[PDB]
Amino acid sequence: AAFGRATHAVVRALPESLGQHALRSAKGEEVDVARAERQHQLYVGVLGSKLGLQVVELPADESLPDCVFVEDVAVVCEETALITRPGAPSRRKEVDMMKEALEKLQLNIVEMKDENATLDGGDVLFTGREFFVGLSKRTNQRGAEILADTFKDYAVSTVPVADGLHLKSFCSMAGPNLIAIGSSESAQKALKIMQQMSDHRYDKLTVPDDIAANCIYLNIPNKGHVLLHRTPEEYPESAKVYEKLKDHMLIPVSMSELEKVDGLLTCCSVLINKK
Ligand SMILES: *[C@@](=[N])([C][C])[N][C][C][C][C]([N])C([O])=O
Prior knowledge:
Elements: E1 8-12, H1 18-21, H2 33-50, E2 54-58, E3 74-77, E4 80-83, H3 95-103, E5 108-111, E6 124-126, E7 131-135, H4 141-150, E8 156-160, E9 171-175, E10 178-182, H5 185-196, E11 203-207, E12 216-220, E13 224-230, H6 236-244, E14 248-253, H7 256-259, E15 270-272
Parallel strand pairs: 1-2, 4-5, 7-8, 10-11, 13-14
Antiparallel strand pairs: 1-15, 3-4, 6-7, 9-10, 12-13
N5-(1-iminopropyl)-L-ornithine (LN5) binds next to loops.
PDB class: hydrolase
Keywords: ddah, hydrolase, Metal-binding
Assembly: monomeric
C-alpha cells in the first residue's frame, strides 16, 4: 500500500499525424516521428519489461495527433478513475478508448461531462496524501471541483499556472513526501503557494531545469524506490541531482522529440495499483 506502488500502466502509441499535427505551445524544430517512436518504445519498455508492470498499450488514432499523452485523459486514485474533459476540444475523443480500457481493469469510472468544466490530467499533482490541481489554459476552477468531489477522500487545493503549460510541466513526485521542483521563479512561486495550503510539509528535490522536474516515481516489489528521470544528454545538471538519490533505482529516460510538443515523462502513461 506504499506511495508509488503500481501494477498496471496505460500507454498509447503515437500516431504518424503527431509529427505535423500535435498541438505545441511554441514553434520549434522538426519532429523525427521515427525517433519519437523509438523514445516511446523505450519508455514503455522500462515500465513493462524492466519494472514488471502490466502494460495496457492502446492503438494510435491518426485523427487524434496527441493521443499518446494519456495522462491528460484520466486521473486514477485508489480504485477510482476520473475520466477528464481536456482543455483542448480536439483531444476529447481520446477519452473514449481510455474509458473502455479502464473498464476492463474493473476501475470505478467517473466521467467529467460538465460542458463547462475542463481538466487536463497533467495539471493534477497527487502527493499520496492530497491533491494539487493547476489552474491553466487546460484546466478550470469547475474542473478542479469535479475532481475534488470524485475523490472526496482527499483534500484538493488549487494553484495558478502560467504561460501555455501544465502544473506538472515543472514538478512531480520524486518519492514519498518528496516533490521534484524546478528552480525557475514560476516554479518556486507555485510550490510555495502549494506549501501554505497543506497540513503537511513536503521535502523538495530542486533541479536546475523545470522540465526535468517531471519524472516518474514508482515503488515496485523487491526493488523499492524507482525513478525514471530525464537523461544527462538532455539535462545534465538535473540528472546530477537525481544521481544523489542513492536508495533510488535511477533510470534515465529520453523524451526529446515529444518534448517538442510539450510531452514530458508523466504525460505518457496512467499508473494503476491493482491490489
Ligand atoms: C503532460 N501531462 C504535461 C503536463 N501533458 C503534455 C500534453 C502535450 C500535448 N501536445 C497537448 O495536450 O498539447
